[PDB]
Design a protein around this motif. Structure first.
Motif, PDB file in Angstrom:
ATOM      1  N   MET D  39      76.086  -0.687  45.390  1.00 30.05           N
ATOM      2  CA  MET D  39      75.236  -1.866  45.240  1.00 30.05           C
ATOM      3  C   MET D  39      73.756  -1.489  45.248  1.00 30.05           C
ATOM      4  SD  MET D  39      77.156  -4.923  47.236  1.00 30.05           S
ATOM      5  CE  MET D  39      77.003  -4.339  48.917  1.00 30.05           C
ATOM      6  N   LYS D  40      73.364  -0.627  46.189  1.00 25.93           N
ATOM      7  CA  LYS D  40      71.980  -0.172  46.234  1.00 25.93           C
ATOM      8  C   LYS D  40      71.590   0.513  44.935  1.00 25.93           C
ATOM      9  CE  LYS D  40      69.412  -0.112  50.201  1.00 25.93           C
ATOM     10  NZ  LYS D  40      67.946  -0.318  50.301  1.00 25.93           N
ATOM     11  N   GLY D  42      72.788  -0.104  41.944  1.00 25.27           N
ATOM     12  CA  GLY D  42      72.562  -1.116  40.920  1.00 25.27           C
ATOM     13  C   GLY D  42      71.171  -1.717  41.003  1.00 25.27           C
ATOM     14  N   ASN D  43      70.760  -2.093  42.216  1.00 24.28           N
ATOM     15  CA  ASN D  43      69.407  -2.623  42.387  1.00 24.28           C
ATOM     16  C   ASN D  43      68.351  -1.616  41.948  1.00 24.28           C
ATOM     17  OD1 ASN D  43      69.383  -5.283  43.165  1.00 24.28           O
ATOM     18  ND2 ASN D  43      69.574  -4.838  45.345  1.00 24.28           N
ATOM     19  N   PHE D  46      68.050  -1.269  38.106  1.00 19.13           N
ATOM     20  CA  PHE D  46      67.279  -2.342  37.476  1.00 19.13           C
ATOM     21  C   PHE D  46      65.777  -2.120  37.664  1.00 19.13           C
ATOM     22  CE2 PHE D  46      65.411  -6.569  37.380  1.00 19.13           C
ATOM     23  CZ  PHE D  46      65.949  -7.075  36.225  1.00 19.13           C
ATOM     24  N   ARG D  49      64.539   0.812  35.618  1.00 16.49           N
ATOM     25  CA  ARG D  49      64.456   0.564  34.185  1.00 16.49           C
ATOM     26  C   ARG D  49      63.191  -0.199  33.837  1.00 16.49           C
ATOM     27  NH1 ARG D  49      70.086  -0.179  34.268  1.00 16.49           N
ATOM     28  NH2 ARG D  49      69.681  -2.393  34.654  1.00 16.49           N
ATOM     29  N   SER D  85      37.826  -0.094  14.665  1.00 11.75           N
ATOM     30  CA  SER D  85      37.906   0.461  13.293  1.00 11.75           C
ATOM     31  C   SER D  85      39.200   0.005  12.618  1.00 11.75           C
ATOM     32  CB  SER D  85      37.819   1.951  13.314  1.00 11.75           C
ATOM     33  OG  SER D  85      37.943   2.483  12.003  1.00 11.75           O
ATOM     34  N   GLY D  86      40.041  -0.740  13.335  1.00 12.03           N
ATOM     35  CA  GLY D  86      41.282  -1.269  12.738  1.00 12.03           C
ATOM     36  C   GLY D  86      42.359  -0.211  12.673  1.00 12.03           C
ATOM     37  N   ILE D  87      41.978   1.058  12.794  1.00 11.89           N
ATOM     38  CA  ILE D  87      42.958   2.179  12.774  1.00 11.89           C
ATOM     39  C   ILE D  87      43.722   2.160  14.100  1.00 11.89           C
ATOM     40  CG2 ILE D  87      41.573   3.574  11.174  1.00 11.89           C
ATOM     41  CD1 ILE D  87      40.649   5.195  13.634  1.00 11.89           C
ATOM     42  N   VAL D  89      45.816   0.368  15.144  1.00 17.37           N
ATOM     43  CA  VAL D  89      47.267   0.077  15.072  1.00 17.37           C
ATOM     44  C   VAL D  89      48.009   1.273  15.669  1.00 17.37           C
ATOM     45  CG1 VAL D  89      49.184  -0.308  13.478  1.00 17.37           C
ATOM     46  CG2 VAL D  89      46.892  -1.263  12.977  1.00 17.37           C
ATOM     47  N   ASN D  90      47.447   2.473  15.532  1.00 21.60           N
ATOM     48  CA  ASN D  90      48.206   3.625  15.994  1.00 21.60           C
ATOM     49  C   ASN D  90      48.385   3.540  17.498  1.00 21.60           C
ATOM     50  OD1 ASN D  90      47.701   5.070  13.275  1.00 21.60           O
ATOM     51  ND2 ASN D  90      48.820   6.566  14.508  1.00 21.60           N
ATOM     52  N   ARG D  91      49.575   3.885  17.969  1.00 23.54           N
ATOM     53  CA  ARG D  91      49.921   3.582  19.344  1.00 23.54           C
ATOM     54  C   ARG D  91      49.218   4.518  20.315  1.00 23.54           C
ATOM     55  NH1 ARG D  91      55.839   2.301  19.310  1.00 23.54           N
ATOM     56  NH2 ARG D  91      55.962   4.581  19.449  1.00 23.54           N
ATOM     57  N   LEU D  94      52.358   7.584  19.983  1.00 22.63           N
ATOM     58  CA  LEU D  94      52.145   8.378  18.785  1.00 22.63           C
ATOM     59  C   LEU D  94      50.826   9.127  18.881  1.00 22.63           C
ATOM     60  CD1 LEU D  94      53.860   8.714  16.168  1.00 22.63           C
ATOM     61  CD2 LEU D  94      54.662   7.088  17.829  1.00 22.63           C
ATOM     62  N   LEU D 102      49.509  18.176  17.095  1.00 16.77           N
ATOM     63  CA  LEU D 102      48.528  18.281  15.986  1.00 16.77           C
ATOM     64  C   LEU D 102      47.146  17.844  16.480  1.00 16.77           C
ATOM     65  CD1 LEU D 102      47.879  18.720  12.968  1.00 16.77           C
ATOM     66  CD2 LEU D 102      48.530  16.336  12.599  1.00 16.77           C
ATOM     67  N   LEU D 108      40.831  11.189  14.025  1.00 15.89           N
ATOM     68  CA  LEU D 108      40.762   9.862  14.625  1.00 15.89           C
ATOM     69  C   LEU D 108      39.573   9.751  15.567  1.00 15.89           C
ATOM     70  CD1 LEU D 108      43.477   9.698  13.308  1.00 15.89           C
ATOM     71  CD2 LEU D 108      44.464   8.950  15.451  1.00 15.89           C
TER      72      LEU D 108
ATOM     73  N   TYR E   1      54.625  14.042   7.168  1.00 13.01           N
ATOM     74  CA  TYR E   1      55.204  13.189   8.198  1.00 13.01           C
ATOM     75  C   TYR E   1      54.370  11.933   8.414  1.00 13.01           C
ATOM     76  CZ  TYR E   1      51.638  14.791  11.476  1.00 13.01           C
ATOM     77  OH  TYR E   1      50.448  15.052  12.110  1.00 13.01           O
ATOM     78  N   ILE E   3      53.925   7.796  10.215  1.00 10.32           N
ATOM     79  CA  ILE E   3      54.155   7.002  11.413  1.00 10.32           C
ATOM     80  C   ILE E   3      54.504   5.597  10.951  1.00 10.32           C
ATOM     81  CG2 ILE E   3      53.172   6.065  13.511  1.00 10.32           C
ATOM     82  CD1 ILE E   3      51.382   8.499  13.646  1.00 10.32           C
ATOM     83  N   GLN E  10      56.761   2.003  16.941  1.00  3.32           N
ATOM     84  CA  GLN E  10      56.390   2.998  15.953  1.00  3.32           C
ATOM     85  C   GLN E  10      57.162   4.288  16.182  1.00  3.32           C
ATOM     86  OE1 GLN E  10      52.111   3.319  16.205  1.00  3.32           O
ATOM     87  NE2 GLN E  10      52.047   1.160  16.765  1.00  3.32           N
ATOM     88  N   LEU E  38      51.433   3.664   9.041  1.00  2.00           N
ATOM     89  CA  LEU E  38      50.087   3.606   9.664  1.00  2.00           C
ATOM     90  C   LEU E  38      49.329   4.927   9.499  1.00  2.00           C
ATOM     91  CD1 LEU E  38      51.673   2.203  12.917  1.00  2.00           C
ATOM     92  CD2 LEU E  38      51.221   0.934  10.819  1.00  2.00           C
ATOM     93  N   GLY E  48      44.823   5.254   7.788  1.00  2.00           N
ATOM     94  CA  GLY E  48      44.639   4.001   7.045  1.00  2.00           C
ATOM     95  C   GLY E  48      44.185   2.871   7.935  1.00  2.00           C
ATOM     96  N   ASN E  49      43.244   2.048   7.456  1.00  2.00           N
ATOM     97  CA  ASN E  49      42.862   0.827   8.211  1.00  2.00           C
ATOM     98  C   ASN E  49      44.173   0.083   8.413  1.00  2.00           C
ATOM     99  OD1 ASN E  49      40.185   1.264   8.701  1.00  2.00           O
ATOM    100  ND2 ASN E  49      39.542   0.462   6.702  1.00  2.00           N
ATOM    101  N   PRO E  50      44.321  -0.892   9.325  1.00  2.00           N
ATOM    102  CA  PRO E  50      45.651  -1.457   9.647  1.00  2.00           C
ATOM    103  C   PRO E  50      46.732  -0.487   9.164  1.00  2.00           C
ATOM    104  CG  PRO E  50      44.086  -3.164   9.488  1.00  2.00           C
ATOM    105  CD  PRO E  50      43.311  -1.894   9.756  1.00  2.00           C
ATOM    106  N   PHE E  73      73.823  -4.607  37.748  1.00  3.08           N
ATOM    107  CA  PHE E  73      74.265  -5.229  38.985  1.00  3.08           C
ATOM    108  C   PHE E  73      73.058  -5.462  39.874  1.00  3.08           C
ATOM    109  CE2 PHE E  73      75.642  -5.085  43.381  1.00  3.08           C
ATOM    110  CZ  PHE E  73      76.614  -6.045  43.381  1.00  3.08           C
ATOM    111  N   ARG E  74      72.933  -6.677  40.399  1.00  9.48           N
ATOM    112  CA  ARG E  74      71.845  -7.034  41.295  1.00  9.48           C
ATOM    113  C   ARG E  74      72.403  -7.858  42.440  1.00  9.48           C
ATOM    114  NH1 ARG E  74      67.187  -9.846  37.908  1.00  9.48           N
ATOM    115  NH2 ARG E  74      66.103  -9.142  39.792  1.00  9.48           N
ATOM    116  N   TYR E  75      71.744  -7.804  43.593  1.00  7.63           N
ATOM    117  CA  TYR E  75      72.187  -8.593  44.729  1.00  7.63           C
ATOM    118  C   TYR E  75      71.033  -8.808  45.692  1.00  7.63           C
ATOM    119  CZ  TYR E  75      72.310  -4.904  48.249  1.00  7.63           C
ATOM    120  OH  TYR E  75      71.968  -3.921  49.139  1.00  7.63           O
TER     121      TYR E  75
END
Lengths: 58, 201, 37, 117, 101
Positions: D39-40, D42-43, D46, D49, D85-87, D89-91, D94, D102, D108, E1, E3, E10, E38, E48-50, E73-75
Motif C-alpha cells: 500500500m505504501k 502505491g502511494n 503516485f 509519477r 523572437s518567436g523561436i 517554440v523550441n522546448r 529539446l 550539438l 539560438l 534531423y 524537431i 516535441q 520547429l 524557424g520563427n514559430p 493504488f491510493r489510500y
RNA sequence: UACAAGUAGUCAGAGCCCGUUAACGGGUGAUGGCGUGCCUUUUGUAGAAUGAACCGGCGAGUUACGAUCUCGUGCAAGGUU
RNA sequence: AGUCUUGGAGGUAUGCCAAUGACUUAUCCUUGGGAGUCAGACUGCGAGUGAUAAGAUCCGUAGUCGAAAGGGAAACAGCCCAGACCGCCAGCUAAGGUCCCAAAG
RNA sequence: AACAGUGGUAGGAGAGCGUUCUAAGGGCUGUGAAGCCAGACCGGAAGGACUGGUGGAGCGCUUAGAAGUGAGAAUGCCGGU
C-alpha cells in the motif's frame, strides 16, 4: 458593451456571498472567462467581487 | 388449434381440434417462471439443523479461576462449539392465486403446442405389459428423448411398461402439472385425456 | 420456457444487502449503524 | 449448506506476497507487513509519477543555464530573448539535448542576443 | 534531423529511427505527415520563427498498442479510504522516412 | 556489500549477469530526490492513547410471527381461501 | 438566488420595506422511504462587550480543519495560495522567491 | 456529437466480482480431474486464463435458485513454529 469577466483568484477562503455572486456570473473554474452584455446590474455585481476578478471591455 | 391425429402404429390421416381457450392461449412467461419456482420449491424437505450456543453439551461454568473467570467454553468463537445463526428447520412452501395456477398450466400447454411438441394419440392400449413393446411404439412415433404420456384414468398396462425406460413418465389426466410438462421434451396424450383436461379447465 | 433459459420478470427480484463484509461496499466496519446511536 | 473456504484466502494472500518480491527480511515473507508495504508503495508511486515531471524540468533548466553562460548570457535573459523572437517554440528538453549533442545551437543564443538589443 | 511537435510535445528525429507517439489515429501501414517542424538541424540549419515554413517530416505507421500496465493504488490512513485502478496508455509506433518535403 | 546514519520503499540511474506467455524484456543494484507503520478512538496522534511474537484454520446483521413502504404478477369493484 | 432598477419611508452625522421591471443565473415547494449528528477546534474581523482599543466576558460574523491531498511559512491538523478521474521526460502562472546547499537576477 | 462534471469520514443510492449447494442444457478428464508449486499473460477493480512440474480421481461452462457468503485486528479460540 460585451464585457469579458475573468476569474483570476480562487473562491476558497472567501465568505459565501462572493461565492454566490461569482457563481451567478457563470464562473466555475479558475482562469475561466465569460461574456456578458454591459448593464448597471452586471457592473454592480462586478464591483462587489472586484478584487477577485479582472474585467476588460471588448 | 388443429393437430394431426395419430395411432399407436405411428400413422394416421385423421385430425382433431384443440379447444383454443386451453391450447391457444398466448403464453405468459412470468407466470410460468413463478409457477416453476413455487413448484420446484415445496419439494425440498428443509430437514437441517445446527446446535445453538446453549444446546451444546457443557458451558455452564466460567472457564478460568486461578491458583479471573470469563465466558463459556461454548462461545461461538471457541473451537468447542456454538454456531451463531446457522440453518434451522423450516418450510419453504407457499401458495399462488388459483387463477395464476390455471393460467400457468394453460400457458405451458399452449407453448408446447406451438413448438409442435404435442402428439395426440387415438388410444394407448397394451395387451401385454412388456417394456419391449413400449420401446417399439415410442420408436414408431419418433420419440428419442424425454417424453410425458398422459392417459385418461390410469390404465395399468401402460404404467407398468415404460416404467423402466429411463426418460419416460406416465401420468393420468388430473396429474399434469407445470414441471413434468416443461421438463419432458415431448407430449403424448390420448384423445380422451384431451377431453378431460379441456373440460376441467 | 425451457428449464435452462429461465428469466425472471424484470424488477421482481432484488439482491439482498449483506452488511459487514468489507469497506468497499459502504457498510463495513460500523455496519451501517454508524457510531454509538 | 456450509461453505468452507481455503483456496480463495490462499490465492489472495499469495498475490500480495508475490507483489512484495525483493523487499527486506520479513517484508517479503509475512503477509501482514507485506500488505502494508505494498500500500505504501502505491502511494509513493503516485506521488513520484508527479515528482518525475517536476524533476526533469529542473534538470533541463540547469543544463540550459550552464550552456548559456558558456555564451555570455544567463538562463533568464536567454529565455526572454528566445520568447521575444518567436523561436521560443523550441522546448527546454529539446534545447538541453542541443546542448550535450550539438553546442552549435549557439545559433539560438546568437538570435536571442540580437533580439535583446 | 528535425524537431517535430506531435502530442502536445516535441521530439527529435533522424531518418530510420523508430519513435513512439500518442495515439495519433491513423492505421498500420499508412504514411503520416507532420507539419509543425520547429528546427531542421544538420549541415544547413534552419531555425524557424514559430515553425520553419515549408518543412514536413513523413513517417510510416507500424502498430497501435498500449504500454505495460500500471496499477494506480491510493489510500488514506485511519480513514478506510482505498481506491485501485488499472491503466494502459495507448501509443503509436512510427518509423521516420524523409525528413524534408 | 567493510567512510557508512535508513517506517527500509518509491522515482531517476550506470555497471554486471541472464534470455521471457517478445514484451518501450528479467535479476541485482553503486549513487541522487522524496518519504514520521496498520487498526481503533478523538476536536486533534509519529507519540509516553489502545491491540497484535509469527503462520494456518475457525470467528459477528439470521429465522419466525405482526406493522408499514416500494417494485413485479394475476384479477379488478371486487379480490381471496 | 445575485445585482441594478423603481419608489418611498428610518436615523441624529449605513441600513428597512415593498416594489415590478429587467440582466444574469438554476434553483425551491409538497408527499413518501432511509439516515447519521447533539462536549467540535483554531484563526481573522468587529465593536455588539470594559459598546471603548481592548485584554477580558461572552456576543455575533467569516474562514479552514474535522471529512482536503498539492506549493509556501526550516520542521507545523486550524496561517497564505489552491480543491487530486488516470497517463505524458509539454507550456503559462498563484503565494513565495532568484550567492551555494537549492530551480531562477 | 457539443457542452459540463468526476477529493471525501458518518451516511443514502447504483453496478458488479468470487465461494458451497441444487435444477436444466452442454461438456471435460487415466493420452491424466480436483488440489499444490512457478512464470516476463488478460481486464477499470473485485478477479480470469494459458504453459511447465507434482498429483493420482474426479471436475467444471450457460441460465436460474438457495445461503452456515469473502477475515488482518475482538488482551478472540485451537494447532504448528
Amino acid at each position: 458593451a460585451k464585457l469579458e469577466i475573468t476569474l483570476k483568484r480562487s473562491v476558497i477562503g472567501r465568505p459565501e456571498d462572493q461565492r454566490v455572486t461569482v457563481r451567478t456570473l457563470g464562473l466555475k473554474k479558475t482562469n475561466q472567462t465569460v461574456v456578458h452584455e454591459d448593464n448597471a446590474a452586471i457592473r454592480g455585481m462586478i464591483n462587489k467581487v472586484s478584487h477577485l476578478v479582472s474585467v476588460k471591455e471588448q | 388449434p388443429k393437430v394431426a391425429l395419430y395411432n399407436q402404429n405411428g400413422s394416421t390421416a385423421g385430425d382433431i381440434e384443440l379447444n383454443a381457450s386451453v391450447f391457444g392461449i398466448e403464453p405468459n412467461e412470468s407466470v410460468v417462471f413463478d409457477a416453476i419456482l413455487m413448484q420446484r420449491a415445496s419439494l425440498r424437505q428443509g430437514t437441517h439443523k445446527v446446535k445453538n450456543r446453549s444446546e451444546v453439551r457443557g458451558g455452564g461454568r466460567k472457564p478460568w479461576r486461578q491458583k479471573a473467570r470469563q465466558g463459556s467454553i461454548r462461545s461461538p468463537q471457541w473451537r468447542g462449539g456454538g454456531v451463531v445463526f446457522g440453518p434451522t428447520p423450516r418450510s419453504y412452501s407457499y401458495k399462488l392465486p388459483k387463477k395464476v395456477r390455471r393460467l400457468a398450466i394453460k400457458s405451458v400447454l399452449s407453448s408446447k403446442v406451438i413448438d409442435n411438441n404435442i402428439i395426440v394419440l387415438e388410444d394407448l392400449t397394451l395387451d401385454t405389459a412388456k417394456t419391449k413393446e413400449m420401446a417399439a411404439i415410442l420408436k414408431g412415433l419418433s420419440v428419442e428423448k424425454k417424453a410425458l404420456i398422459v392417459t385418461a384414468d390410469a390404465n395399468e398396462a401402460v404404467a407398468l411398461s415404460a416404467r423402466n425406460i429411463p426418460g419416460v413418465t406416465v401420468v393420468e389426466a388430473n396429474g399434469i402439472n407445470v414441471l413434468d410438462v416443461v421438463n419432458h421434451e415431448k407430449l403424448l396424450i390420448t384423445k380422451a385425456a384431451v377431453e378431460k383436461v379441456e373440460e376441467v379447465l | 420456457m425451457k428449464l435452462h433459459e429461465l428469466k425472471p420478470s424484470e424488477g421482481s427480484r432484488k439482491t439482498r444487502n449483506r452488511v459487514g463484509r468489507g469497506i468497499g461496499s459502504g457498510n463495513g466496519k460500523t455496519a451501517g449503524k454508524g457510531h454509538k446511536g | 449448506p456450509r461453505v468452507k473456504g481455503g483456496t480463495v484466502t490462499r490465492k489472495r494472500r499469495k498475490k500480495v506476497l508475490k507483489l512484495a518480491k525483493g523487499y527486506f527480511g520479513s517484508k517479503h515473507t509475512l503477509y501482514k507487513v507485506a500488505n502494508q508495504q505494498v500500500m505504501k508503495s502505491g502511494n509513493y508511486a503516485f506521488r513520484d509519477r508527479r515528482q518525475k515531471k517536476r524533476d526533469f524540468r529542473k534538470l533541463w533548466i540547469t543544463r540550459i543555464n550552464a550552456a548559456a553562460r558558456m555564451n555570455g548570457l544567463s538562463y533568464s535573459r536567454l529565455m526572454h530573448g528566445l520568447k521575444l523572437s518567436g523561436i521560443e517554440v523550441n522546448r527546454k528538453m529539446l534545447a538541453d539535448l542541443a546542448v550535450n549533442d550539438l553546442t552549435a545551437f549557439n545559433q539560438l543564443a546568437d538570435a536571442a542576443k540580437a533580439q535583446l538589443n | 534531423y528535425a524537431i517535430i511537435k506531435t502530442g502536445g510535445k516535441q521530439i527529435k528525429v533522424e531518418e530510420g529511427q523508430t519513435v513512439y507517439i500518442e495515439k495519433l489515429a491513423a492505421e498500420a501501414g499508412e504514411t503520416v505527415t507532420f507539419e509543425d517542424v520547429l528546427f531542421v538541424g544538420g549541415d544547413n540549419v534552419k531555425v524557424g520563427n514559430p515553425t520553419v515554413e515549408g518543412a514536413t517530416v513523413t513517417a510510416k505507421v507500424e502498430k497501435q498498442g498500449r504500454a505495460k500496465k500500471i496499477t494506480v493504488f491510493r489510500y488514506k490512513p485511519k480513514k478506510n479510504v482505498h481506491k485501485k485502478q488499472g491503466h494502459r496508455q495507448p501509443y503509436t509506433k512510427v518509423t521516420i522516412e524523409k525528413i524534408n518535403a
